[PDB]
RNA sequence: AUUGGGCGUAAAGCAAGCGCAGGCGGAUUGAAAAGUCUGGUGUUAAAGGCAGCUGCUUAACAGUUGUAUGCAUUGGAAAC
RNA sequence: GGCGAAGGCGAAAACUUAGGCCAUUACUGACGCUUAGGCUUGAAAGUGUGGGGAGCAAAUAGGAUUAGAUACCCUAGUAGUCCACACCGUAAACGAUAGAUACUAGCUGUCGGGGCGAUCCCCUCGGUAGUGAAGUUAACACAUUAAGUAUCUCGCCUGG
RNA sequence: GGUGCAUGGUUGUCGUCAGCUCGUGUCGUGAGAUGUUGGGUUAAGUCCCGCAACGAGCGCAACCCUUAUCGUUAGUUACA
């Protein structure tokens, strides 16, 4: 019944995930599922990508590709094997007229990227790593770098039916009656032989006071 | 030398027959007028012992704190002693977790210091409402912490002006192994106190003299000469 | 212990 | 050091909206040289409770002098209608006690004493009874001091 | 539950009193002889235990040596 | 508030009387505690003989209450409710503390005697009450009228 | 084709009420109280003098948007 903070803070406190526009109700659904195709491909098909976000800008058969990944060593790598294959597959999946021209540039030590934290929690979960040590590791790696409040929840089994352990942990600063509280969020569905575990993490990226503008 | 008698005109008197037998070692005769009377030899010996210990801890060159919550005369008096003797002080109700724990209030003292340095830097870097609100916050913080700002480690020694009303402070002191001296009014528990000063403290006429004597005892650490215990002039007393 | 000095 | 755990009491507090789960843990700390402390901790996770109890026990340390792993005179630890009797043992026979009492005995430093709990079997009560028993011992030099002759006869 | 529990609210003080025997009970002087300790003779069988040896390959075991628990008992020891 | 072994004992008396308390500097000298057995009373109800039924009211009836009124209220009414004889011996018959000899912090209120001595208080021998130390009891809580440490004698507890 | 009496996700509910916790320290052999436990104020645990406690987290309010007022950039495909 609670509201999604990540969706709450979109549009007024962060740059857009996809800020393009074209003619409507003629082809919008096609392009808006085609961008979600690459979104899912970078979110699932490559667990080692550690992509922070996705940004697609389409304008009349001309598209720019913004790709920010915390681990660049498996997109360019050696002998340029990954780039040609993935670009050819994406060209097949989007059309044979547009140009891709992707750009790669690393962010400043993304210990505030909730997405990669959810990825690491999953890599623990399918490794049958117990919840406690994994969450301690994530909390250490996010907090020791220097940042504000975090809170993590896990929902589902813990290798046993009749769920009796699914807690909430918050160890910082996170207001909810202030839109001026820019934050990062991740929700992931870890897979186990017992079912699916929903892991949610909120990591506060600090307070952006005295800005009053969206860029 | 020390332990003058003639000037110390009012040193006895206590509330109506509430004395405890644990102070019977200090009440030799029997009094018919609903009061108590001490013996001068025992109080001079206690004063000498207290002087010895305070000079020892002055040679220690540590930190001292005074406490006080009863009648405002003692409060203003210990304030004076604070501005005669460089020492921390408390003008309001004693706060728990002060001597049995240090971090809990060390962080608060550090926050007050942060506010102090902010005010030092800030002269026109704030709006109107927030400036007044922060000044009020400073006032509220110094209401309990203003005197106690020179301590960076657990204090070596304090004193007690009234063992009765500040039983919390003496209990916390006894919990730790560090000692404390107390202006022991009769009927108090002597087992909690380690150095006993048997003199009147409920009345201010004796409390002022005792406070002045202890301030003079501790004042030698600064190479700053004593005021009383050697001067033939009588002390001042004004109440109405 | 009277001998902290 | 080593710090065995003795009791893990699964408890909770029932308020509006149900039972908030918060279990308690018992720990005892010692150097095997005389220093002894004990700690109670309530928390909703095991390791933080263990750490809190260890810190609390370390904040209540106290040492006892040794008589070659034994106790030279009988002591009984009075604690809430739950008393433990301690009877002297020869110069080396090995440990004899119940689990909690045992761990207490070898962590204190002793290695030979006759122990028997009387009454109930709540762990903290035996802990307090054993503390009372060991505390109420006085060395032969103590009674030598209280008498004119200060020396072993 | 003498050694080693209790009887206010958990099981438990008779609703109380007058109150035989029966168990106790202020202090001393002197004789005392039932307890209390020192003395050995009769035993308390032996075997069985407790310890030390001997032997069957050590042990199991058997034997060996002393070991004690209870009443007579004649001297005495003097506080209870 | 005081006595009474317990229950209880309140208008006024006279009588026969019962047990205390206080100084006992007098007298006798261990006669003092308990006492399962044996006896002395026994809150109320009820039982069997005489007064009375003034009020009261178990039961019975009538009227309302709700599906239900043998109870909840009103009207009367049944013995008993007292005074005399013989019973019956059960009470949450409570301080839920068996009965005596010791000692132990205090503090306050209150009844009697002695001297003191207008009432007002100063003490002592005592009882009746709260407060509240150590100490004790699991806790509540007890405390100079112990549930504290002691000790003695009779009873009771070994699960509903 | 199943089983929310395995699940994620989302949602209803008490309720846009206002309370629910934690860190440190303390009383209590323990449960647990402790802060949050008294009063002044509204919508509030809003704030404050306290009080063996000092702080921190969520709770709402502030900046978020819209409307009611005016100064200015624009006067068109509204003014004319």
CA distance C1 to chain B (A): 10
Protein-covered nucleotides on strand G (Cβ within 7 A)? 6-14, 20-27, 29-33, 48-64
Strand partners, D20: D13
Q: Is D26 exposed, middle or buried (0-12, 13-18, 19+ CB in 10 A)?
A: buried
In DSSP terms, D40 is beta-bridged to D26
∠ Cα A171 A175 A178 (to 5°):
165
Radius of gyration of chain D (CA): 18
Q: Which residues contact D123 (CB under 8 A, 6 or more apart)?
A: D6, D7, D26, D100
Nucleotide nearest to B32 (CA to C1'): F122
Candidates A77, B225, B133; CA nearest to A85 is A77
> CA–CA separation, B235 vs B217, rounded Å?
16
DSSP classification of residue B206: H
Residue with tokens 């903290």: D124
Residue B193 C-alpha, separation from nearest chain C C-alpha, in angstroms: 15
**Separation of alpha carbons D63 and D108, rounded Å:** 9
* A93-115 core/surface letters (b: 16 or more CB in 10 A; e: else): ebeeebeeeeeeeeeeebbbbbb
Selection from B33, B36, B31, B32 nearest residue B19 by Cα: B36
Q: Between the CA atoms of B206, B211, B216 and B217, what dihedral angle is there, to the nearest 10 degrees?
A: 100
Rounded CA separation A134/A149 (Å): 18
Among residues A44, A102, A104, A40, the alpha carbon closest in space to that of A69 is found at A104
| Closest CA in chain B for residue C3 | B56
Residues of C in Cβ contact (< 8 Å) with B194: none
B60:C4 CB<8 A:
yes
Please state, in angstroms and rounded to a whole number, the distance separating the CA atoms of residues B14 and B123: 53
Asked if residue A214 keeps its beta carbon closer than 7 A to nucleic acid strand G, the reply is: no
Bridge partners for A211 per DSSP: none
Q: C5: which chain B residues are within 8 Å (Cβ-Cβ)?
A: 56, 59-60
SS3 content of chain B, % helix, strand, coil (to 5): 45, 5, 50
Q: Which of B81, B88, B238, B74 is nearest to B166 (CA)?
A: B74
**Within chain C, how many helices (H) and strands (E) appear?**
0, 0
Give chain B positions within 8 Å (CB) of C2.
53, 56
C interface with B, Cβ–Cβ < 8 A, is: 2, 4-5
Angle at B97 between CA B94 and CA B103, to 5 degrees: 125
Closest residue in C to B56 (Cα) is: C5
Chains touching chain A, criterion 3+ CB pairs below 8 Å: none
Largest interatomic CA distance in chain B: 69
Note whether C2 contacts B56, CB cutoff 8 Å.
yes
Please give the nucleotide, over all strands, whose C1' is closest to the CA of residue B137: G48
Pick out residues 30-59 of chain B having their CB under 7 A from any atom of nucleic acid strand F: 32
User: Do the two chains B and C touch, given a threshold of 8 Å on CB pairs and at least 3 pairs?
Assistant: yes
- How distant, in Å, are the alpha carbons of A30, B95, B109, B153, B235 from that of B147? 72, 13, 11, 15, 26
CA of D79: nearest nucleotide by C1' is: G29
DSSP-derived pairing of the beta strands B157-160 and B180-182: parallel
Instruction: Give how far B60 is from chain C: nearest CA, Å.
Output: 7
Tokens (6 digits) for D122: 């709540």
Q: Are B48 and B70 in contact (CB under 8 A)?
A: no
Contact D132, D78 (CB under 8 A): yes
CB pairs under 8 A between B and C: 8
Strands D75-77 and D83-87: antiparallel
Q: Is B214 helix (H, G, I), strand (E, B) or coil?
A: helix
Whether any strand F atom is under 7 angstroms from the Cβ of B191: the reply reads: no
* D13 CB-near residues (< 8 Å, 6+ apart): D19, D20, D22
Residues paired with residue D19 on neighbouring β-strands, in sequence order: D14
User: Could you tell me if D51 and D135 are in contact, meaning their C-beta atoms sit under 8 angstroms apart?
Assistant: no
Dihedral sign, Cα of residue D103, residue D108, residue D114, residue D118: negative
- Per the CB < 8 Å rule, is C2 touching B59? no
Q: CA D42, CA D38: separation in Å to the nearest integer?
A: 14
Contact A66, A84 (CB under 8 A): no
Of D85, D80, D81, residue with least CA distance to D101: D85
Q: Mapping DSSP to helix (H, G, I), strand (E, B) and coil, where does residue D103 land?
A: helix
Chain D residues 85-144 with Cβ under 7 Å of strand G are 122, 124-125, 128
In C, which residues are within 8 Å of B57 by CB distance?
A: 4
Q: How far is CA A36 from CA A14, A31, A39, A41, A51, in A?
A: 20, 9, 5, 8, 14
What is the DSSP code (8-state) at residue B218?
Answer: H
Residue B25 backbone class (left: φ over 0; alpha: ψ -120 to 50; beta: rest): alpha
Residue carrying the six token digits 């000469």: B225
Measured CB to CB, residues of chain B less than 8 Å from chain C are: 53, 56-57, 59-60
CA neighbor of A161 nearest in space, from A193, A120, A205: A193
Longest dimension (CA), chain C: 10
From B219's Cα to the closest Cα of chain C, the distance in A is: 19
Angle at CA of residue A87, ends A84 and A89, nearest 5°: 105
Distance, in Å, from the CA atom of A122 to the CA atom of A130, rounded to the nearest integer, reads: 11
Answer for the pair B169, B74: CB distance below 8 angstroms, yes or no: no
Method: cryo-EM
Burial of D17 (0-12, 13-18, 19+ CB in 10 A): exposed
Neighbours of D139 (CB within 10 A): 12
Rounded CA-CA distance A141/A118 in Å is 13
Query: How far apart (Å, rounded) are the C-alpha atoms in residues A97 and D20?
Result: 61
Distance D50 CA to F47 C1' (A): 77
Instruction: State this model's resolution in angstroms.
Output: 5.3
In angstroms and rounded to an integer, the radius of gyration of the C-alpha atoms of chain C is: 4
In this structure, what is the dihedral angle of CA atoms B221, B225, B228, B230, given to the nearest 10 degrees?
A: 110
Number of other CB atoms surrounding residue B211 within 10 Å? 22
User: For residue A210, which nucleotide's C1' is closest to its Cα?
Assistant: G63
Which two tokens mark A112? 């505030």
Contacts of C4 in chain B (CB under 8 A): 56-57, 60
Residue B63: strand, helix, or coil: coil
Chosen from B54, B56, B157 to mutate, greatest number of chain C CBs within 10 A: B56
Which residues touch B162 (CB under 8 Å, ≥6 apart)?
B68, B70, B183, B185, B201, B202
Give the rounded distance of the alpha carbon of B103 from its chain centre.
23
Q: Is the CB of B166 under 7 A from strand G?
A: no
CA–CA distance from D55 to each of B106, D28, D61 (Å)?
A: 20, 10, 10
Residues of C in contact with B59 (CB under 8 A): 5
Measured over the CA atoms of residue D79, residue D83, residue D88 and residue D92, the dihedral's sign is negative
How far apart CA A77 and CA A80 sit, in angstroms, is 6
């Amino acid at each position: 019944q609670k509201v999604n903070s990540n969706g709450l803070r979109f549009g007024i406190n962060k740059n857009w995930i996809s800020r393009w526009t074209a003619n409507s109700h003629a082809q919008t659904a096609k392009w808006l599922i085609e961008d979600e195709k690459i979104r899912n491909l970078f979110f699932v098909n490559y667990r080692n990508a550690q992509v922070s976000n996705v940004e697609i800008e389409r304008t009349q058969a001309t598209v720019d590709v913004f790709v920010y990944a915390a681990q660049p060593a498996f997109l360019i790598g050696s002998e340029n094997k990954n780039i040609q294959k993935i670009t050819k597959q994406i060209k097949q999946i989007i059309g044979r007229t547009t140009n891709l021209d992707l750009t790669i540039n690393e962010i400043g030590s993304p210990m505030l990227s909730a997405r990669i934290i959810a990825r690491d929690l999953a890599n623990a979960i399918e490794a049958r790593v117990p919840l406690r040590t994994a969450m301690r590791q994530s909390l250490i790696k996010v907090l020791k770098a220097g940042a504000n409040g975090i809170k993590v929840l896990v929902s589902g089994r813990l290798n046993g039916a009749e769920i009796a352990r699914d807690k909430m942990y918050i160890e910082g600063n996170m207001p909810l009656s202030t839109l001026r509280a820019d934050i990062d969020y991740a929700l992931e569905k870890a897979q186990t032989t017992y079912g699916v575990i929903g892991v949610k993490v909120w990591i506060n990226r600090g307070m952006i006071y005295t800005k009053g503008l969206n860029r | 030398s020390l332990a003058k008698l003639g000037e110390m005109r009012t040193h006895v008197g206590m509330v109506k027959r509430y004395w405890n037998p644990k102070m019977g070692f200090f009440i030799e005769p029997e009094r018919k007028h609903n009061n108590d009377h001490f013996v001068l030899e025992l109080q001079r010996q206690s004063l000498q012992t207290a002087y010895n210990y305070v000079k020892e801890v002055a040679q220690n060159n540590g930190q001292i704190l005074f406490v006080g919550t009863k009648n405002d005369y003692v409060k203003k008096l210990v304030n004076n002693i604070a501005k005669r003797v460089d020492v921390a002080f408390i003008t309001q109700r004693w706060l728990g977790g002060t001597l049995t724990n240090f971090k809990t209030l060390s962080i608060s003292i550090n926050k007050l210091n942060k506010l102090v340095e902010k005010q030092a830097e800030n002269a026109a870097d704030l709006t109107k409402k927030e400036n007044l609100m922060l000044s009020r916050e400073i006032e509220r913080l110094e209401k309990f912490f203003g005197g106690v700002k020179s301590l960076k480690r657990l204090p070596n020694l304090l004193i007690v002006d009234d063992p009765v009303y500040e039983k919390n402070a003496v209990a916390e002191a006894n919990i730790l192994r560090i000692p404390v001296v107390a202006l022991c009014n009769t009927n108090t528990n002597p087992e909690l106190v380690d150095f006993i000063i048997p003199a009147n403290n409920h009345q201010p006429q004796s409390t002022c003299l005792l406070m002045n004597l202890l301030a003079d005892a501790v004042a030698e650490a600064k190479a700053m000469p004593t005021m009383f215990a050697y001067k033939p002039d009588e002390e001042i007393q004004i109440e109405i | 212990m009277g001998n902290f000095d | 050091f080593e710090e065995r755990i003795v009791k893990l009491k699964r408890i909770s507090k029932t308020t509006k909206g149900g039972r908030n789960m918060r279990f308690s843990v018992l720990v005892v700390v010692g150097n095997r040289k005389g220093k002894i402390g004990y700690g109670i901790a309530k928390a909703l996770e095991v390791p933080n409770a263990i750490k809190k109890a260890i810190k609390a026990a370390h904040n209540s340390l106290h040492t006892i002098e040794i008589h070659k792993g034994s106790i030279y005179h009988e002591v009984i630890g009075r604690s809430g209608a739950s008393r433990v009797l301690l009877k002297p043992a020869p110069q080396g026979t090995g440990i004899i006690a119940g689990g909690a009492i045992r761990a207490i005995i070898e962590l204190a430093g002793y290695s030979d004493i006759y122990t028997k709990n009387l009454g109930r079997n709540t762990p903290i009560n035996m802990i307090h009874a054993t503390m009372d028993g060991i505390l109420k011992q006085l060395s032969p030099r103590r009674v030598a001091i209280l008498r004119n002759k200060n020396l072993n006869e």
